[PDB]
Amino acid sequence: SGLRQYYLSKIEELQLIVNDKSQNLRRLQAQRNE
Amino acid sequence: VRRAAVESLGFILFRTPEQCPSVVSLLSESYNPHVRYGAAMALGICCAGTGNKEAINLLEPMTNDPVN
Amino acid sequence: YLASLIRSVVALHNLINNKIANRDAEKKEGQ
Amino acid sequence: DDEFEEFPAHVWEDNWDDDNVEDDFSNQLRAELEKH
Amino acid sequence: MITSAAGIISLLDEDEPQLKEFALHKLNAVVNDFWAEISESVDKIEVLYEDEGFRSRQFAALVASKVFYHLGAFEESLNYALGAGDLFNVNDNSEYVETIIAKCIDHYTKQCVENADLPEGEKKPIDQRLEGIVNKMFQRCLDDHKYKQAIGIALETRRLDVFEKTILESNDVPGMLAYSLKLCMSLMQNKQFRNKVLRVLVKIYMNLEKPDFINVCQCLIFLDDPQAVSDILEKLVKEDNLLMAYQICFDLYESASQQFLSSVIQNLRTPKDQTLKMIKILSGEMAIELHLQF
Amino acid sequence: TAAAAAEHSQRELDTVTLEDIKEHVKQLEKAVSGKEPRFVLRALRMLPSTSRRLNHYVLYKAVQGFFTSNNATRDFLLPFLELPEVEAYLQLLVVIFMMNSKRYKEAQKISDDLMQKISTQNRRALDLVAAKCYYYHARVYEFLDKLDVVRSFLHARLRTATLRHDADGQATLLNLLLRNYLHYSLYDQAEKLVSKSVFPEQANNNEWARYLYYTGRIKAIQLEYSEARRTMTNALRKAPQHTAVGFKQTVHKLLIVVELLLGEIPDRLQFRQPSLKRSLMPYFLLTQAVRTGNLAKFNQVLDQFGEKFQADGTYTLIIRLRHNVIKTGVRMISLSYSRISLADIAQKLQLDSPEDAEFIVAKAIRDGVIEASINHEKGYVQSKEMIDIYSTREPQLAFHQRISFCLDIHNMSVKAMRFPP
Amino acid sequence: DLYSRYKKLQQELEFLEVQEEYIKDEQKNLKK
Amino acid sequence: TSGAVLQAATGMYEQLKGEWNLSKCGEELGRLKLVLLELNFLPTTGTKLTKQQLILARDILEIGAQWSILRKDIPSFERYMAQLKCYYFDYKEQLPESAYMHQLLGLNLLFLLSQNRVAEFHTELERLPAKDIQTNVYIKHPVSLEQYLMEGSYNKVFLAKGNIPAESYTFFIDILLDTIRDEIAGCIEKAYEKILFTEATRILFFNTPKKMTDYAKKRGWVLGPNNYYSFASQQTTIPSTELAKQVIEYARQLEMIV
């Protein structure tokens, strides 16, 4: 079944990075708002 | 020049209209009225003819902004 | 060092305040 | 949070000194004076 | 069960290239469970590989790749996995094989993107064994009836010939062409690579039995090649398909820039009623008049 | 109908517990259906007390009123009992049920099925449930006294958990694997693994505690006593407060032994505290013997409580004790003296001759537990004239560690101030 | 599908990095 | 086939025993190692031969280790003892108890003490069962030597020389004397002031007085001052650069936005 595993590994890594980066960006947004 | 920078940002991001509210929401709440105006115009150019709900949500409060 | 310790305590207090605010918001949204 | 189940399980703030001495300070001093 | 591998590693110190092979066989049998112990003894297997000790050249490299895998030094694990030869067993459901294949793809892609910009001559060569590994991975992509995602990895790898081959040898050639065009227009950034990809797409479109010309004209607009579009239009004129010619021309007017339209008109000028009508459409009389009436 | 009324009240409580299970599920969907990270810990933290309140008939009704998508695998639970994450949570609950029921065959099989499921699904919010499943599967095999096949299983699973850049599963698998090595007394493979794995700097408190215990034990056996003592003390400070009585007992026991080996005397507040007195009393006697230097009483204590030592696992450290018992004597002597003559250490350390004094004190200095010089031209052991350590970089360095620490907590605290929208 | 998801996430990552850097800079200037 | 190969291995082992039960043993053991490769070096589970493999495993590997110790070759001893340890502690259920095991096991412990590998020494002691530490003599003696050496009773360590359960415990007593001399040195140069020639001879149990110059001809603690055995005792500026680094680090973590 093709490189489903390879694409899924990369996809999940990037998903984690985007998730925590969104957390951090909202944090900074709030500090800057203050 | 700050205003022109924000407007140019607007021009850059129009094949991905969903993104412009992200870049411009942080600018719209800035103490510099020129940067605020540039943020508004960038939203306009980006989400032109798209009726983006997030865009209108960001613009709606700015209509009661103390600078003409 | 004393300055740094005071800063740490204040930072933790603010983190607690924010976690409680978010917890209250989540509980109210759920209910 | 989690009880580590994998591990099976006076009112005086004492701090040692519970040694074995020829009385604390009576016979010692008696013998001390005797040899001085 | 074993409780220690130091005994097995102890064989490698022997001077018997008959004992050494059994040592390595069992070591590979039990790496997955005793990687840590062997990590200090990996130094032995490195020189054993570099030498010509019978089977030392392949199977020892395999165990070296496994041990470096478990440890975490992937960059140097790859250098030995590639040399491991046919023993790598590119077809098996072993986390080691999937992960080293992933690293192979990543490294090959990095090298390709890095040597694409560089001149034709001075390009950092590609380990032919690594190339073979990736190529068998692609052939497996196809064999799995998973034609898609092969387009993606091929576009990443910057190798087009496989892009052509995969989009051709597949069901729903129109669907694959539309998906590839969406990817080419939307995501990929490098303009030179996008031009190469669009040239491949145009070649594919031309080679069809019932050619799709609207997409061809759009692609040519991207590529900035008005001479080709002029020749296509003259072809549609001689071989009568007037409705298709008119549609191509209207789309050309609505998309292509003024210089491109002028170039097409000039190349076309270089029965004639149809030619004049297309020139009119491209110039813009009909479109502006119709919009105004609307 | 007293039994009926009691059952009625218990079943009302059971409805409350089912509501709690539903709330945990809902939190899990907040995490995964919401797709946001974490919050599985929120839904999971009540796992221990929930396991305590588990009930057979309650689960009998649960395994017929739950599993909205009835995939028919519910019949692997129903006979013995008589979503992508909630199913794992329910399966873990069921293995807990068999655990406390003492049913360790279907328990192992159902745990295996749970493991197959979690291994198959390559989720990223299921890693925490996978960690808990790992721990309880290990406990099943532990009550079944294999501890061996689990080694390879957990070890491959750790490989997966470290390829996927996971933290909770990585830590828990590392911890259980270390427990297996220690249960089979493989303090060479244990050491190599600890040396060539890096523990997640951001790991649960309860997992830091266990890792620190095992690492300290490994170093203690390996004869790295200073770092062993630091590790056990830090583990204790990391340990839970109102729970884990057994864990605290074991860390304390090993800490007493390790300190006695370093040459110190422990704190007596330990033997004071009520949760430990009965556990640590043998070590109370042992510490008395070592402090006194009374080898006779030491031998009596060994002959009298040796079984408990071989049980907890201390029986080689408590001979290395003998060694560090003479060491403890010399450390006290060199803690209160500045120029004691050798013929005077011989006696006050219970030795034979000034030659033996030379050798033993020299070795003590070599091990660096007394920090003195020595002179045999006239035969005295002058110590180091203490230098006023405030015109020195020692305050610099100490405050440097502490300031670095405080800055790090400010960083980590200002971070993690997540705002929801 | 898969490659589209991969590349969308990639673009999102660089976009968020740019936003991070900008917010850093504006917080500096706002302090001033 | 299996029966025939087992018979061939058995015949080779019987020839070995008839030989000695040196160099002849060398080639015989080489061929036996090859035949063991042919058969089963380390069953490694799964196969479950249950051929009482321990029989031939012990035969070959204990005889190999013994020939090694008679030969005075530490690398070969390491190899054979590693294998033997595997066979001892691993296949416990299948293997029958080998009374001819503690000898090599304690001899291994002695070897570890000889090459000052105290960490590994205690790891293997832990591996061993509890009772054997206090019951058996073969193991007790190396345990006793290590305990004495850690306490510092080097005189007892020396006096133990005559006390040896079996003559096999040889050449590691000698390497142990060498290592003891090295450790005594360690003590001397770490914490003393100065040791004269006579006292150095008295303390360090050197060779004959004429070679007493040994370990000064070898380690040479800058000897020479006044009396050649003056021991040359091997016993304030602001670190401005390092302090600047650390303070700049404080400033960096305090001013960076996070």
Side-chain angles (χ1 to χ4, degrees), chain D residues 1-19, chain F residues 45 48 135 139 179 206 210 214 240 243 246-247 249 265-266 268-269 272 291:
Chain D
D1 190 354
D2 54 357
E3 61 86 20
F4 308 157
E5 207 281 334
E6 63 259 57
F7 280 120
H10 293 178
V11 56
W12 317 344
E13 173 46 37
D14 194 356
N15 175 347
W16 272 277
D17 188 18
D18 52 15
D19 291 331
Chain F
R45 275 163 166 170
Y135 172 61
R139 274 176 37 65
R179 184 165 179 68
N206 308 148
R210 274 164 190 138
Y214 297 124
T243 185
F247 171 58
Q249 286 183 12
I265 308 295
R268 190 142 166 153
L269 191 64
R272 192 87 193 169
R291 189 181 58 77

Side-chain angles (χ1 to χ4, degrees), chain G:
Chain G
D1 196 359
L2 277 295
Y3 178 41
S4 55
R5 255 180 71 191
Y6 174 23
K7 265 287 203 283
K8 291 174 71 175
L9 303 154
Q10 203 164 350
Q11 181 62 11
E12 190 169 2
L13 188 153
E14 292 84 4
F15 183 64
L16 286 150
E17 273 155 322
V18 172
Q19 294 170 261
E20 294 293 328
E21 300 193 0
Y22 173 82
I23 286 288
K24 304 269 186 61
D25 291 331
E26 205 178 342
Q27 183 172 359
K28 284 172 42 44
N29 289 277
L30 281 153
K31 284 264 196 55
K32 273 180 205 167

Side-chain angles (χ1 to χ4, degrees), chain A residues 4-34:
Chain A
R4 183 178 182 270
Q5 183 62 255
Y6 164 47
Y7 271 115
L8 281 162
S9 66
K10 294 312 191 43
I11 287 157
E12 276 179 345
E13 208 174 338
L14 272 295
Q15 203 54 350
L16 281 150
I17 293 168
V18 184
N19 291 129
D20 57 330
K21 277 289 212 309
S22 66
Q23 297 318 113
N24 189 358
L25 189 152
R26 283 171 290 171
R27 187 187 71 195
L28 295 164
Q29 177 63 35
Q31 260 193 343
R32 205 292 301 271
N33 290 138
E34 165 206 31

